[PDB]
């Protein structure tokens, strides 16, 4: 399970999906939205083994052709499957709208 | 454009799909697969920028997350789009039997 529920509990490097909330302003100093200042974005971060949940049929064969190869960084690449909306709101000109962008958060990582 | 046409052309770092040629046992040692030898799995390495084609919204979220804060490997992950099978060749006890490998390939990435 490679989602935000066992990542989010012990360690992890392989394609486990890690905490990755971004202040709108701070990290990305998005001007076009107002609030919220920021959210829990999350994010997958390192490669993964073979029986690792593979999606496609070459996440199973590269996954071991650097599993098989020490020194090569060719490996896969965790990713964001699921992902979730994000109720901010912005302003166009002078009317304020509030919104919930799509895809504006993730809910599960994989290894595309 | 990232695929494989744009870059097997000249130099590229961030979201661009690489040649990764995988002989089927000199990488994976795959013992059930007799041929071919190996064949063009390509694959991709590198993040992507904002305008890089983005997948998902959190495509262009986080890929100004990495490219504002320097220092973060959180950005994104570059992965096999569309894939390709391949026609191969194994043994099954005693009858040899030709198949084709779904998404055994690649043939463009992306950002997910």
């Given at each position: 399970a490679l989602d935000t529920n066992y990542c989010f509990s012990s360690t992890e490097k392989n394609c486990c999906v890690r905490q990755l909330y971004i202040d709108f302003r701070k990290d990305?100093?998005?001007?076009?939205?107002?609030?919220?200042?920021?959210?829990?974005?999350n994010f997958c971060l390192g490669p993964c083994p073979y029986?690792?949940?593979?999606?496609?049929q070459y996440s199973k064969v590269l996954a071991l052709y650097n599993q098989h190869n020490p020194?090569?960084?060719?490996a896969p690449c965790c990713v964001p499957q699921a992902l979730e909306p994000l109720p901010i709101v912005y302003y166009v000109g002078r009317k304020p709208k509030v919104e919930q962008l799509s895809?504006?958060?993730?809910?599960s990582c994989k290894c595309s």
């Amino acid at each position: 399970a490679l989602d935000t529920n066992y990542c989010f509990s012990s360690t992890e490097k392989n394609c486990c999906v890690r905490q990755l909330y971004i202040d709108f302003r701070k990290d990305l100093g998005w001007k076009w939205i107002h609030e919220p200042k920021g959210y829990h974005a999350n994010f997958c971060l390192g490669p993964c083994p073979y029986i690792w949940s593979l999606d496609t049929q070459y996440s199973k064969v590269l996954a071991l052709y650097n599993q098989h190869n020490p020194g090569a960084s060719a490996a896969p690449c965790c990713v964001p499957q699921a992902l979730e909306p994000l109720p901010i709101v912005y302003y166009v000109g002078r009317k304020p709208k509030v919104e919930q962008l799509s895809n504006m958060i993730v809910r599960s990582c994989k290894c595309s």
